[PDB]
Amino acid sequence: NSFSGYLKLTDNVYIKNADIVEEAKKVKPTVVVNAANVYLKHGGGVAGALNKATNNAMQVESDDYIATNGPLKVGGSCVLSGHNLAKHCLHVVGPNVNKGEDIQLLKSAYENFNQHEVLLAPLLSAGIFGADPIHSLRVCVDTVRTNVYLAVFDKNLYDKLVSSFL
Protein backbone atom coordinates (compact mmCIF):
# COMPACT_ATOMS: atom_id res chain seq x y z
CA ASN A 1 0.00 0.00 0.00
CA SER A 2 0.78 3.72 -0.06
CA PHE A 3 1.52 4.37 3.61
CA SER A 4 5.12 5.63 3.58
CA GLY A 5 7.60 6.60 6.24
CA TYR A 6 6.11 4.73 9.21
CA LEU A 7 8.07 3.09 12.00
CA LYS A 8 6.95 -0.44 12.78
CA LEU A 9 6.16 -0.96 16.45
CA THR A 10 4.62 -4.42 16.25
CA ASP A 11 3.38 -6.83 13.60
CA ASN A 12 0.35 -4.63 13.00
CA VAL A 13 0.94 -1.18 14.56
CA TYR A 14 2.88 1.53 12.73
CA ILE A 15 3.56 5.13 13.76
CA LYS A 16 4.60 8.36 12.03
CA ASN A 17 5.07 12.03 13.00
CA ALA A 18 2.45 13.50 10.64
CA ASP A 19 -0.68 15.61 10.42
CA ILE A 20 -3.53 13.13 10.03
CA VAL A 21 -5.32 15.50 7.66
CA GLU A 22 -2.34 15.68 5.32
CA GLU A 23 -1.76 11.92 5.55
CA ALA A 24 -5.40 11.28 4.66
CA LYS A 25 -5.31 13.69 1.72
CA LYS A 26 -2.21 11.96 0.34
CA VAL A 27 -3.17 8.32 0.90
CA LYS A 28 -6.98 8.42 0.60
CA PRO A 29 -7.31 5.45 2.96
CA THR A 30 -10.33 3.24 3.11
CA VAL A 31 -10.89 4.25 6.75
CA VAL A 32 -9.76 7.31 8.69
CA VAL A 33 -10.56 7.41 12.40
CA ASN A 34 -11.94 10.53 14.04
CA ALA A 35 -11.48 11.31 17.74
CA ALA A 36 -15.16 12.05 18.26
CA ASN A 37 -17.35 13.00 21.18
CA VAL A 38 -20.76 11.47 21.84
CA TYR A 39 -22.59 14.37 20.16
CA LEU A 40 -20.41 14.31 17.03
CA LYS A 41 -19.67 18.01 17.56
CA HIS A 42 -16.40 18.43 15.69
CA GLY A 43 -15.13 21.64 17.27
CA GLY A 44 -11.53 21.12 18.24
CA GLY A 45 -8.59 18.80 18.24
CA VAL A 46 -8.43 16.12 15.58
CA ALA A 47 -12.18 16.30 14.98
CA GLY A 48 -12.13 20.03 14.32
CA ALA A 49 -9.22 19.61 11.89
CA LEU A 50 -10.86 16.77 9.99
CA ASN A 51 -14.17 18.59 9.79
CA LYS A 52 -12.54 21.79 8.52
CA ALA A 53 -10.77 19.80 5.79
CA THR A 54 -14.19 18.58 4.57
CA ASN A 55 -15.50 22.16 4.40
CA ASN A 56 -18.00 21.32 7.19
CA ALA A 57 -19.58 18.44 5.26
CA MET A 58 -18.63 16.08 8.09
CA GLN A 59 -20.55 18.21 10.59
CA VAL A 60 -23.69 18.41 8.41
CA GLU A 61 -23.68 14.63 8.01
CA SER A 62 -23.04 14.15 11.72
CA ASP A 63 -25.92 16.41 12.75
CA ASP A 64 -28.29 14.31 10.63
CA TYR A 65 -26.90 11.13 12.24
CA ILE A 66 -27.52 12.44 15.77
CA ALA A 67 -31.00 13.70 14.90
CA THR A 68 -31.90 10.19 13.68
CA ASN A 69 -30.00 7.96 16.13
CA GLY A 70 -29.17 10.00 19.22
CA PRO A 71 -25.77 10.28 20.84
CA LEU A 72 -23.11 7.62 20.79
CA LYS A 73 -21.88 5.90 23.96
CA VAL A 74 -18.40 6.48 25.34
CA GLY A 75 -16.39 3.61 23.91
CA GLY A 76 -18.69 3.38 20.90
CA SER A 77 -18.43 4.27 17.25
CA CYS A 78 -20.26 4.85 14.01
CA VAL A 79 -19.18 4.65 10.38
CA LEU A 80 -19.98 7.68 8.22
CA SER A 81 -18.60 9.05 4.97
CA GLY A 82 -14.95 9.98 4.62
CA HIS A 83 -15.85 12.84 2.25
CA ASN A 84 -12.69 14.08 0.49
CA LEU A 85 -10.35 12.37 2.99
CA ALA A 86 -11.17 8.66 2.85
CA LYS A 87 -13.88 6.26 1.78
CA HIS A 88 -15.23 6.04 5.33
CA CYS A 89 -14.71 7.82 8.61
CA LEU A 90 -14.92 5.72 11.76
CA HIS A 91 -15.99 8.12 14.50
CA VAL A 92 -14.79 6.61 17.79
CA VAL A 93 -15.48 8.03 21.24
CA GLY A 94 -12.69 7.56 23.74
CA PRO A 95 -13.18 8.62 27.36
CA ASN A 96 -12.52 12.26 28.20
CA VAL A 97 -10.56 12.23 31.46
CA ASN A 98 -11.25 15.95 31.88
CA LYS A 99 -15.05 15.02 32.16
CA GLY A 100 -14.34 12.21 34.64
CA GLU A 101 -15.04 9.41 32.19
CA ASP A 102 -13.72 5.95 32.96
CA ILE A 103 -10.31 5.35 31.38
CA GLN A 104 -11.14 1.63 31.14
CA LEU A 105 -13.48 2.53 28.26
CA LEU A 106 -10.40 3.29 26.18
CA LYS A 107 -10.03 -0.45 25.57
CA SER A 108 -13.65 -0.64 24.33
CA ALA A 109 -12.96 2.32 22.06
CA TYR A 110 -9.97 0.61 20.43
CA GLU A 111 -11.92 -2.64 19.96
CA ASN A 112 -13.93 -0.85 17.27
CA PHE A 113 -10.78 -0.80 15.13
CA ASN A 114 -10.88 -4.61 14.83
CA GLN A 115 -13.89 -4.39 12.49
CA HIS A 116 -11.68 -2.81 9.77
CA GLU A 117 -8.70 -4.34 8.05
CA VAL A 118 -6.60 -1.16 7.74
CA LEU A 119 -7.04 2.20 9.47
CA LEU A 120 -5.33 5.59 9.61
CA ALA A 121 -5.86 6.84 13.16
CA PRO A 122 -4.88 9.24 15.92
CA LEU A 123 -4.13 8.10 19.44
CA LEU A 124 -7.46 7.93 21.21
CA SER A 125 -8.14 9.98 24.32
CA ALA A 126 -4.90 11.95 23.83
CA GLY A 127 -4.70 15.68 23.35
CA ILE A 128 -7.71 17.56 24.65
CA PHE A 129 -9.29 14.34 25.93
CA GLY A 130 -6.75 14.37 28.75
CA ALA A 131 -5.36 10.83 28.87
CA ASP A 132 -1.70 9.95 28.93
CA PRO A 133 -0.60 9.25 25.33
CA ILE A 134 1.87 6.58 26.46
CA HIS A 135 -0.99 4.67 28.08
CA SER A 136 -3.16 5.12 24.99
CA LEU A 137 -0.45 3.62 22.78
CA ARG A 138 -0.09 0.65 25.14
CA VAL A 139 -3.84 -0.03 25.07
CA CYS A 140 -3.78 0.27 21.27
CA VAL A 141 -0.98 -2.28 20.89
CA ASP A 142 -2.63 -4.68 23.31
CA THR A 143 -6.11 -4.40 21.78
CA VAL A 144 -5.96 -3.84 18.04
CA ARG A 145 -5.30 -6.87 15.82
CA THR A 146 -5.86 -5.24 12.43
CA ASN A 147 -3.40 -2.94 10.69
CA VAL A 148 -3.30 0.51 12.22
CA TYR A 149 -1.22 3.45 11.01
CA LEU A 150 -0.97 6.04 13.76
CA ALA A 151 -0.35 9.70 12.97
CA VAL A 152 1.07 11.82 15.79
CA PHE A 153 1.13 15.54 15.10
CA ASP A 154 3.51 16.71 17.85
CA LYS A 155 7.14 15.81 17.15
CA ASN A 156 8.14 15.95 20.82
CA LEU A 157 5.36 13.52 21.72
CA TYR A 158 6.24 11.25 18.79
CA ASP A 159 9.85 11.02 19.97
CA LYS A 160 8.71 10.25 23.53
CA LEU A 161 6.30 7.53 22.38
CA VAL A 162 8.98 5.81 20.30
CA SER A 163 11.76 6.10 22.86
CA SER A 164 9.65 4.78 25.74
CA PHE A 165 8.00 1.91 23.87
CA LEU A 166 8.07 -1.56 25.45
Q: Distance between CA atoms of 111 and 142, rounded to whole angstroms?
A: 10
Q: What angle do CA 97, 150, 46 make, to 5 degrees?
A: 50
Burial bucket for residue 165 (CB in 10 Å: 0-12, 13-18, 19+): middle
Burial bucket for residue 109 (CB in 10 Å: 0-12, 13-18, 19+): buried
Q: Where are the chain's structural domains?
A: 7-164
Q: Distance between CA atoms of 122 and 32, rounded to whole angstroms?
A: 9
Resolution, given in Å to one decimal, reads 1.1
Radius of gyration of the chain (CA): 15
Q: Distance between CA atoms of 85 and 142, rounded to whole angstroms?
A: 28
The beta strands (E) that lie in the chain are given as 7-8, 13-17, 31-35, 77-81, 88-92, 118-121, 147-152
- What experiment produced this structure? X-ray
Topology, domain 7-164? Leucine Aminopeptidase, subunit E; domain 1 (3.40.220)
Q: Distance between CA atoms of 58 and 158, rounded to whole angstroms?
A: 28
